[PDB]
Design a protein around this ligand. Sequence first.
Ligand SMILES: *[C@@H]1O[C@H](CO)[C@@H](O)[C@H](O)[C@H]1NC(C)=O
Ligand SMILES: *[C@@H]1O[C@H](CO)[C@@H](O)[C@H](O)[C@H]1NC(C)=O
Ligand SMILES: *[C@@H]1O[C@H](CO)[C@@H](O)[C@H](O)[C@H]1NC(C)=O
Length: 197
Amino acid sequence: DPPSDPTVEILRNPSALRSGDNVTIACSVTGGNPPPDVFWYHENKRLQSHSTLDTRSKEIKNIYSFIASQNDNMAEYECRANNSRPKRKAMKLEVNYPPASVELFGESNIRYGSSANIQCKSLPSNPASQITWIINGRSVPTPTQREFVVENGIVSSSNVSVHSNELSVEAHQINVECMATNPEGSSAKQHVIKIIA
Ligand SMILES: *[C@@H]1O[C@H](CO)[C@@H](O)[C@H](O)[C@H]1NC(C)=O
Ligand SMILES: *[C@@H]1O[C@H](CO)[C@@H](O)[C@H](O)[C@H]1NC(C)=O
Ligand SMILES: *[C@@H]1O[C@H](CO)[C@@H](O)[C@H](O)[C@H]1NC(C)=O
C-alpha cells in the first residue's frame, strides 16, 4: 500500500548565540493606563529602538535586532516599563566565540643542558579552548590545563617543559608553538627560544 508523501522542513533553533549572527530580541507588555513606554537597556543606557503599540490588542511590543558580539553579549539586556513617578525584566545572553589569540611566556635564551618551562594563556573564549603544543613540527602529548572564568568568557592556561639535554650540542634554537581551539575556531602563536652556552 502507499505511504502518504514526505514533507521536509528546516528547524530554526536550538543553538547558542554565535560569534556574530543576526539576533532579534523582543519585549512584550500588555497595556495599562496611561500606555507605558517600553525601552531596551544595554549597560544601563537607553538603546535607540522604537516601541510599537497595537491599538486593537493594547499590547506594547519592542523588537530589537543586532549582530551578536564576543566583546559583550555574555552580559544582560534589560527591558523597562515607565509610568511617571518602573517595571523591569533583564536578560543574560550566551554567545559562543573562538579564542582571539594566545600568549606565550618564557625565556628567549636558555643554557644548553638546562631545561625550560613555557606557559601559554589564551584570550577569553566561549566555550573553553583546548591548548595544544607543537615543538619542532611535532605535536606533543597535551599537558593538563587550568581553565579560569572571566567576564564574557573562559581562559585556558597550559605549561609545557622543554629540555635541551635531549637535544644535540649542535641545536641552535627550539620552536615552541602554542594553539587554542574551541568549536568556533582556533588561533596560534610561535615563540622562539635560542640556546646559549
Ligand atoms: C537582521 O534582521 C533584521 C530584521 O530582523 C534586518 O532588519 C537586518 O537587515 C538583518 N541584518 C542582517 C545583517 O542580516
Ligand atoms: C518616562 O515616560 C514618559 C512618558 O511615559 C516619557 O516621556 C519619558 O521620557 C520617560 N522617562 C524616562 C527617564 O524614561
Ligand atoms: C605554570 O608555571 C607558572 C609559573 O610561570 C606557575 O605559577 C603555575 O602554577 C604553573 N602551572 C602549572 C599547571 O604547572
